């Protein structure tokens, strides 16, 4: 399978990890670009294609390097996580079409939706805090996890890793607000939450953007191309 690393060692390695992934899985829109920054469209792959994200650089030193996320490419959805020390793929119940060879696949009774995760995690995304330490804590929870039913701490761990990987890949705003934590706490704002819940509608509108007037998607308003590029990095391919 295709393989990418997200290296959390420093702000710099984190941003450069995300930029490298974006360059490989998406193609810049001509009309929404300034300098080297663009909004990009996910490359269309055959149905069910996925890639792996290996998590690195969480703390000092070999350590904390057994977590791998499996991401369906066409929608950037996290299909589950792999414990590479036990060779076990814990797969959400809405991703039984994701087949990973060479691993033990545990089909979980839990789906990947934010509603399910927040209920099991007893944690709302709006106001959720993410620090380097909370990513290390999340890593430790996922490595300690077993069975086919998601627990509170595994659900909290997925909520935090999805935010700083898939949602950061989609939204430059989230990448920029979180990366200071790797140098402080990142606190997910209602605005951040509203972005993630409107990614499909945002993706449907931006390819029609010409020149440089405003763009309005529901309550999301972009006054200019700088507002767009500051906020959105990667969109769905429709």
């Amino acid at each position: 399978m295709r393989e990418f690393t997200i290296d959390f060692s420093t702000q710099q390695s984190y941003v450069s990890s995300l930029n490298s992934i974006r360059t490989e899985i998406s193609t810049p829109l001509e009309h929404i670009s300034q300098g080297t920054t663009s909004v990009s469209v996910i490359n269309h792959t055959p149905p069910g294609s996925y890639f792996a994200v290996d998590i690195r650089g969480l703390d000092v030193y070999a350590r904390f390097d057994h977590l791998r996320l499996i991401i369906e490419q066409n929608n950037l959805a996290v299909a589950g996580f792999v414990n590479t020390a036990t060779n076990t793929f814990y797969r959400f119940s809405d991703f039984t079409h994701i087949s990973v060879p060479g691993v033990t696949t545990v089909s979980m009774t839990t789906d990947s939706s934010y509603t399910t995760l927040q209920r099991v995690a007893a944690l709302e995304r709006s106001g959720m805090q993410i620090s380097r330490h909370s990513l290390v804590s999340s890593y430790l929870a996922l490595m300690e996890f077993s069975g086919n039913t998601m627990t509170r701490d595994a659900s909290r761990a997925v909520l935090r890793f999805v935010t700083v990987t898939a949602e950061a890949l989609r939204f430059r705003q989230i990448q920029r607000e979180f990366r200071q934590a790797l140098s402080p706490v990142y606190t997910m704002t209602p605005g951040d939450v509203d972005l993630t819940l409107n990614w499909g509608r945002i993706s449907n509108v931006l390819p029609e953007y010409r020149g440089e007037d405003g763009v309005r998607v529901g309550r999301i308003s972009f006054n200019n191309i700088s507002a767009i590029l500051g906020t959105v990095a990667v969109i769905l391919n429709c």
């Binding site: 710099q12 941003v15 450069s16 930029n19 300098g35 080297t36 920054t37 430059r172 990448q175 920029r176 990366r179 700088s226 590029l229 500051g230």
Partner: peptide
Amino acid sequence: GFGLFD
């Protein structure tokens, strides 16, 4: 080399 929006 990063961009100014990063």
